[PDB]
Structure 1
Amino acid sequence: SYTLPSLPYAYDALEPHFDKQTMEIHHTKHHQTYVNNANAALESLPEFANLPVEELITKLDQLPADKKTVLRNNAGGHANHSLFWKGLKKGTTLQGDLKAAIERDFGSVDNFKAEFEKAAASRFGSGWAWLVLKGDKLAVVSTANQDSPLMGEAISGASGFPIMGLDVWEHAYFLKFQNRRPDYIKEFWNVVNWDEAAARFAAKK
């Protein structure tokens, strides 16, 4: 079965940027529900139920027709949140090979940040903003709902290997930021885990 992953840190470890009460709700309620609902939909599918979730979301087209949407949504939700928690950490700096690649592909770090900020702000409704590696070129893309670029273009409207991402569902920022998504996006730069991002870039570059 899928399980709710323990976080890499205490719920207050992202203060003063991301609020501890949201971290706790977001993990124990929202993420838990995707785990539960994906497990329910997978019980009748022994050939899928025990695969890693990041593998499952690459073969949605292999499912029975009546399973595709529920697993897109809930396996997407489990994969995306699992990545998000590991993708947050205070105490990191954009540097080294990943910084140089960002500068190569976007012209500068500030250009990348502006593009990420724009994509994160212009995702209307629920979704995610991503830094992906698409054929050895870094790109900023966004997805709706719990779609992931790992699902491919036909399903998600995006593609590429996720390096990092930002959750822009309202539950991620409501308590502290209300409707002020640009303020939340700005705070993300204080907590994106550039070490994990660098590790992911090294593994698929």
Structure 2
Amino acid sequence: AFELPKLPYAFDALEPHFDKETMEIHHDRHHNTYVTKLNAAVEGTDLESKSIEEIVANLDSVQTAVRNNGGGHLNHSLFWELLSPNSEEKGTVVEKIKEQWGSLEEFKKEFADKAAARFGSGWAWLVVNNGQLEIVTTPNQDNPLTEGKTPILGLDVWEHAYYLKYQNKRPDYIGAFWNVVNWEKVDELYNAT
């Protein structure tokens, strides 16, 4: 019942920040696969009519195919929407980041360092905890929603998100990322809280 969403841009639109070979394989193999495995593990169960957000909200935060693939699907679904070739650092969440970090660049430093420390596969997140902003990281395809915090910006730091172009150089990937953040979508997600 879950469909693999189409990208709002062409594969090359994020160059030379995210390579077009990565984008293709990331979307068409990795995300496609989480979608199929997810559908397969949801046939017949308690979770059949559910939004992925709700499925993910009701997992454990401590192995199951719905945790791995369900998070896979959600994390990546947000992530294509959080990238844009037209990135303008403005709007409600930019301002709210200045109000809590002092400046946008202090925030990115904290983000970049939390993202580079996530050892193994995972995701680096800007979340909303009871109204206030927070940077968290998660292992594998886990998502802050499972811990009661709403993700508004995510960076995928599985090696598959950046190995073709950047190999081991994840801080060069995290740096290229800032040039492609759809801050209009970050706003949209903040606003739903």
Deviation at 1:192, TM superposition (A): 1.0
State how 1:1-205 maps to structure 2 within 5 Å: 1-45=1-45, 47-60=46-59, 69-152=64-147, 159-204=148-193
Aligned residue for 1:94, secondary structure, equals: coil
Alpha-carbon distance in 2 for matches of 1:76, 1:203: 19
Aligned residue for 2:11, secondary structure, equals: coil
Q: Which runs of 5+ in 1 are unaligned?
A: 62-67, 153-158
On the 8 A contact 2:97/2:104 being kept in 1, the answer is: yes
Alpha-carbon distance in 2 for matches of 1:203, 1:33: 28
Alpha-carbon distance in 2 for matches of 1:178, 1:89: 23
Higher relative contact order (CA 8 A, sep 6+): 2
Identical residues among aligned pairs (%): 54
Letter in structure 2 aligned against 1:55: E
Deviation at 1:109, TM superposition (A): 1.0
Q: Which runs of 5+ in 2 are unaligned?
A: none
Alpha-carbon distance in 2 for matches of 1:197, 1:10: 20
TM-score (norm 2): 0.95
Letter in structure 2 aligned against 1:33: T
Alpha-carbon distance in 2 for matches of 1:44, 1:98: 40
RMSD, aligned α-carbons = 1.3
Deviation at 1:94, TM superposition (A): 1.9
How many residues in Structure 1 have an aligned counterpart in Structure 2? Answer: 191
Aligned residue for 1:201, secondary structure, equals: helix
Alpha-carbon distance in 2 for matches of 1:83, 1:106: 24
Alpha-carbon distance in 1 for matches of 2:82, 2:146: 19
On the 8 A contact 2:91/2:184 being kept in 1, the answer is: no
Structure 1 runs of 4+ with >3 Å offset = none
On the 8 A contact 2:123/2:140 being kept in 1, the answer is: yes
**Which residue pairs with 1:156 in the alignment?**
none
Alpha-carbon distance in 1 for matches of 2:127, 2:139: 15
Letter in structure 2 aligned against 1:41: A
Alpha-carbon distance in 2 for matches of 1:19, 1:149: 27
Deviation at 1:49, TM superposition (A): 2.0
TM-score (norm 1): 0.89
Alpha-carbon distance in 2 for matches of 1:99, 1:169: 26
